[PDB]
Amino acid sequence: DVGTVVGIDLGTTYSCVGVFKNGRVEIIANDQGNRITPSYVAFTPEGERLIGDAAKNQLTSNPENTVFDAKRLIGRTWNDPSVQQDIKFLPFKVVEKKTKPYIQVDIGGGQTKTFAPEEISAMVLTKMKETAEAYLGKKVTHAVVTVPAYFNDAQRQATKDAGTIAGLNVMRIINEPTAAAIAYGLDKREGEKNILVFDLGGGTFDVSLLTIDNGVFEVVATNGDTHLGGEDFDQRVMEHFIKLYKKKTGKDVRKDNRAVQKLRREVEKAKRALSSQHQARIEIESFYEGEDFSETLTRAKFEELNMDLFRSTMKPVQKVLEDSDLKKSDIDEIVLVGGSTRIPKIQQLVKEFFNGKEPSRGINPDEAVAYGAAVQAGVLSG
Numbered sequence: 212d213v214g215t216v217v218g219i220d221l222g223t224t225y226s227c228v229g230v231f232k233n234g235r236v237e238i239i240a241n242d243q244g245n246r247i248t249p250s251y252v253a254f255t256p257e258g259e260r261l262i263g264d265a266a267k268n269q270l271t272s273n274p275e276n277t278v279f280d281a282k283r284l285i286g287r288t289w290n291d292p293s294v295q296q297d298i299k300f301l302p303f304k305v306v307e308k309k310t311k312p313y314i315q316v317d318i319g320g321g322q323t324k325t326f327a328p329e330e331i332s333a334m335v336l337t338k339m340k341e342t343a344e345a346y347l348g349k350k351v352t353h354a355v356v357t358v359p360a361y362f363n364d365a366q367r368q369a370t371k372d373a374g375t376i377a378g379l380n381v382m383r384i385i386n387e388p389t390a391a392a393i394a395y396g397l398d399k400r401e402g403e404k405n406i407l408v409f410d411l412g413g414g415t416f417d418v419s420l421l422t423i424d425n426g427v428f429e430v431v432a433t434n435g436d437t438h439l440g441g442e443d444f445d446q447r448v449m450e451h452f453i454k455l456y457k458k459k460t461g462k463d464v465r466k467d468n469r470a471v472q473k474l475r476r477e478v479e480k481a482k483r484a485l486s487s488q489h490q491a492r493i494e495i496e497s498f499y500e501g502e503d504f505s506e507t508l509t510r511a512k513f514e515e516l517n518m519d520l521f522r523s524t525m526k527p528v529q530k531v532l533e534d535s536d537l538k539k540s541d542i543d544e545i546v547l548v549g550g551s552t553r554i555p556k557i558q559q560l561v562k563e564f565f566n567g568k569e570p571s572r573g574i575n576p577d578e579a580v581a582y583g584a585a586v587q588a589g590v591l592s593g
């Protein structure tokens with residue numbers, strides 16, 4: 212008895228969970244009221260493990276004892292060149308254990324813990340499970356979980372293993388861009404179609420060319436950038452305010468990690484607000500040296516600060532087209548996935564790339580992966 216099967220987007224930076232209930236997909240909000248959850252772990256001084264928003268939001272002078280971006284390590288060996296490059300940018304200790312890159316952190320009271328990447332991902336899955344369980348008012352045992360299309364055998368297996376640690380039977384692993392297409396019902400169409408999935412998220416950018424024929428998807432080609440996303444757009448805005456504050460006050464605020472953390476949280480909030488309004492205020496009491504911070508950001512200025520990075524997203528799209536032996540006019544469907552596709556300028560540049568073709572619309576782009584997983588989970592629940 213598989214009970215109510217859940218659909219989980221286990222994301223690099225943000226995860227999402229949904230279920231099929233009363234004839235439709237329901238995307239479930241977590242205990243902080245958010246329909247997405249950061250793939251983030253941290254610890255209190257008392258040694259309590261925090262997961263999700265609470266972990267990401269905890270102010271700290273010790274980023275080395277937070278864990279995030281475990282998806283960059285999952286299913287890879289310690290000596291994988293990708294791992295050896297990624298660890299340069301991660302503030303937490305990564306150590307070789309049993310051929311793998313385990314994560315070593317201090318959790319409180321001088322206690323040290325070492326975790327496999329799948330154990331970290333299992334923590335996030337546990338949080339997504341608890342989210343679903345609170346919504347349904349009962350336990351969940353089975354899930355459909357998504358992975359990037361480029362995930363290999365070990366990465367898929369390690370994701371299943373993370374499920375298992377979390378007490379979830381991962382019944383099916385499905386590809387992210389495929390799940391997005393399913394969310395839009397592109398699998399329920401007749402004939403042979405080419406689908407371009409443009410997935411611009413928090414830390415990663417993935418472009419996928421799918422073909423759909425007779426209900427079966429084929430991933431023809433993939434491309435993107437493993438270190439481009441909304442975090443990068445945030446940092447351009449951070450740089451801008453950090454420089455302006457120095458120019459006003461003579462002080463550089465990077466000396467204080469808590470100040471940088473506060474500013475990053477408000478900047479990300481303003482960025483989001485600027486996808487639906489033209490100006491946002493950034494305010495922080497006791498920002499730095501007991502002085503308050505109060506500045507505004509316009510949509511135009513946000514765009515100007517990131518325009519080169521926005522425009523860089525088209526190059527991977529042109530590459531997947533060349534690799535698929537396709538031209539722009541061969542694309543029958545454009546699917547926008549990922550939170551950063553809420554940015555009006557991104558929408559605009561994708562549409563202009565495709566000479567005025569409108570993309571699929573109606574599902575929140577940061578939810579579309581979980582949505583698709585949930586559609587399949589509905590069928591499996593019966």
Ligand SMILES: Nc1ncnc2c1ccn2[C@@H]1O[C@H](COP(=O)(O)OP(=O)(O)O)[C@@H](O)[C@H]1O
Pocket residue numbers: 222223224225226247411412413414415440441442479482483484486548549550551552553554576577
């Ligand atoms: N309304 C908005 N306007 C602009 N960007 C938005 C939003 C809402 C979320 N975001 C940005 O989306 C990024 C996370 O994307 P995601 O697909 O949820 O995460 P992931 O699957 O980990 O790449 C994050 O960088 C998050 O800040």
Ligand SMILES: [Mg+2]
Pocket residue numbers: 222223412549580
């Ligand atoms: Mg994603």
